Assembly symmetry: C3
Homo-oligomer: 194 residues x 3
DNA sequence: TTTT
DNA sequence: TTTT
DNA sequence: TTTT
């Protein structure tokens, strides 16, 4: 989608927030990606991933057939105050809502139905979208058409949690500080080295 | 092979028996596959796997050149009594025998020769084939033509073990019970939910 | 490159030395590869690997633009005394030097710059090249053009270490002894078996 | 961002 | 079912 | 040998 990758280069984004905040390898590996993005000026690049992608509009439609909500697609929404940070929600719902859509493996979809509550990393994803957009709630949608009709669609609403947001902004600010510093640090070793 | 996948949909089968019976992740992941098969009405889908497949008839021939046995290819043989359970032996040998063929990685083949006894998961595979067909023995064949002639072929006979069979049928019955129930359970949550 | 694989069949080589010498799975898996190579008469066969390969000549050039050294490309150099053992340096530098080139993932390249010292497995690689060729030093080069100019190139010299070489030759001799024996052992079981 |  |  |  080209112009959009450009808006994401070297930025922390909602779908990567669990990695930032994990108590671990994934935090440093993510840090390493973004360091490389900022330095090199571009990014790097499966079958289940490829379905989640094609079937996304199918779910967007379904959410509407089910709710009658007015849904606007948007690009990257930069955090209001924190620089180098943003979100790409799957939709603006109404005046104060959002939609985040998954179209995963059937068994995953089943477990979401089984438990009624989305995985904690998606909580972090959704809270961050809310932080970035100032929205009040996000409707979490899981879709899979391979199943019987009465099992294809699941929705659950997730309320903005200002406490969790405050933490995230702390952690993301911390993580961003290290990241900038690290780049700085490297630029200064390499340059003196002339 | 189309019509055959149909005979396997949502069924426990001989080659998956070690997963059922393991003391673990693989049991639940298998359970999850079959739950999804039954619900969705279809299945999901490497280089060593691709050889084992092409070279299989090469081994079938070799077994005959070596034994002079009369070998009949068959499809899925449903367990005589337990429903949703079956086997696909690589052959009916004689009136009371079977053949199960592997054409693995050379080093694997070498280890089979080194030890003379097939991996325990293939024991379970073969016992199950015997359970399903009522046969008396299975000739386990390992083949690899990449090696010198005097190392390409290995055969060892495995006698029906009624004790092990009894266990398997217990475990598979248990596992099937959970599987049906789980589907049932899900169908009833989803349906009341209307 | 065909004629070169032929010179490597069933041989221990510099880039596999860390596997030989590890205190582990990788030693036996390597042993297994070479056993299979010798027995079958051939070998088995990603995106980062594919770059390291294309970009190698780019680095060779750069090393020269930076040093003005006279660099000769060579094939496999068999150890002077130990049979079934060899090295493929990325270059003969001068009369007494070598070059070993990496063109890895950016982040890896960055860590090499960060620490100034190559990973211990490359130490083993380079020492072995020196053992095989009798050279006095190897210039370790890490290259990545995706980065800013002042970060693309890193070089560090590694001096021949006769102590480490002596060990390697012991370990490789040991490992080779087992490997020959194992083949022997197998040939004799299989052959009596006639 | 896309799925585990 | 196909190989680890 | 090529990268982790
Ligand atoms: Mg999104
Ligand atoms: Mg989504
Ligand atoms: Mg079979
Ligand atoms: Mg088979
Ligand atoms: Mg080399
Ligand atoms: Mg190299």
């Amino acid at each position: 989608t080209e112009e959009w990758f450009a808006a994401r280069l070297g930025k922390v984004t909602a779908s990567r927030v669990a990695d930032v905040m994990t108590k671990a390898a994934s935090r440093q590996n993510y840090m390493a990606e973004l360091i490389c993005q900022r330095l090199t000026g571009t990014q790097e690049i499966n079958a289940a991933m490829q379905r989640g992608t094609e079937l996304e509009p199918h779910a967007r439609a379904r959410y509407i057939i089910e709710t009658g909500e007015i849904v606007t697609e948007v690009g990257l929404i930069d955090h209001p105050t924190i620089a180098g940070f943003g979100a790409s929600p799957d939709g603006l719902v109404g005046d104060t809502g959002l939609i985040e859509i998954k179209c995963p493996n059937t068994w995953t979809h089943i477990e979401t139905i089984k438990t009624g509550k989305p995985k904690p990393e998606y909580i972090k994803q959704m809270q961050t979208q809310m932080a970035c957009t100032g929205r009040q709630w996000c409707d979490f949608v899981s879709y899979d058409d391979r199943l019987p009709d009465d099992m294809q669609y699941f929705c659950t609403r997730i309320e903005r949690d200002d406490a969790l947001i405050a933490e995230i902004e702390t952690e993301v600010s911390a993580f961003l500080a290290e990241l900038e510093a690290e780049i700085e640090y490297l630029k200064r070793k390499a340059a003196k080295l002339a």
